Design an enzyme around this catalytic site. Structure first.
Site: not given
Ligand SMILES: COc1ccc2nc(C)c(O[C@@H]3C[C@H]4C(=O)N[C@]5(C(=O)NS(=O)(=O)C6(C)CC6)C[C@H]5/C=C\CCCCC[C@H](NC(=O)OC(C)(C)C(F)(F)F)C(=O)N4C3)nc2c1
Ligand SMILES: [Zn+2]
Length: 199
Positions: A76, A100, A156, A158
């Protein structure tokens, strides 16, 4: 209009989380302008060091972690993008949207974490701000923060590691489990899942 179709740039290493010494701290190794240029050319001649990289596209910034000679991060954040390297863009060698997860060969000069075989549930999450957050393992892919914090502090991060007491890689940070904006738990890709992807 095929002739004008653009190409997406490469992921670019823009810094690292320094864990060499007794104090964890973030270092920036490339600024915005240089990042943009490096993303277009895919040519990055900066020396890489350490296990945890800060990486960026034109629109996102997140982390990437070396384990077993592969630099791993989240789909992602990176999608199917190449990563910049001294000699040009490097194509992913692993891509799994269901987990992911993506990976490239680890850059020259990086160091790799060792996969954890301790079987311990006392973990530590490393964020892009070089915070080391104690996390109790709660399942195959879940862990609770001992001290919950707003999701803003994890955004940020992940692609960063969850580590065991001895510093082995236990998983890759994937998503936050948040209640009313407060992260009480994290979802992560188990290192065992990486090892299966490698075969
Ligand atoms: C497009 O193809 C794909 C394929 C597979 C995917 N698999 C997943 C799992 C997926 O989730 C997306 C992306 C991810 C995400 O934000 N990660 C982090 C990150 O830092 N990101 S990031 O570095 O800023 C950046 C955005 C630049 C890169 C660590 C997070 C920090 C703060 C949380 C912000 C609030 C979002 C909460 C949400 N909560 C959530 O969904 O929890 C579930 C699973 C329900 C459970 F069960 F845990 F509760 C959440 O964390 N996220 C939504 N997107 C996918 C997309
Ligand atoms: Zn261990």
């Amino acid at each position: 209009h095929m002739a004008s179709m653009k190409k997406k740039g490469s992921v670019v290493i823009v810094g690292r989380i320094n864990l060499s010494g007794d104090t964890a701290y973030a270092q920036q190794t490339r600024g915005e302008e240089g990042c943009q240029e490096t993303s277009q050319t895919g040519r990055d001649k900066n020396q890489v060091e350490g296990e945890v990289q800060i990486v960026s596209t034109a629109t996102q910034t997140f982390l990437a972690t070396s384990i077993n000679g592969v630099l791993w991060t989240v789909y992602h954040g990176a999608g199917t993008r190449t990563i910049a390297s001294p000699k040009g863009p490097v194509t992913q060698m692993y891509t799994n949207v269901d987990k992911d997860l993506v990976g490239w060969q680890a850059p020259q000069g990086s160091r790799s974490l060792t996969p954890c075989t301790c079987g311990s549930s006392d973990l530590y999450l490393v964020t892009r701000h070089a915070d080391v957050i104690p996390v109790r393992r709660r399942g195959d892919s879940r862990g609770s923060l001992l001290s919950p914090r707003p999701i803003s502090y994890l955004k940020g991060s992940s692609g960063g590691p969850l580590l065991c007491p001895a510093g082995h890689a236990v998983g890759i940070f994937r998503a936050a489990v948040s209640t009313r904006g407060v992260a009480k738990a994290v979802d992560f890709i188990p290192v065992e899942s990486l090892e299966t992807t490698m075969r």
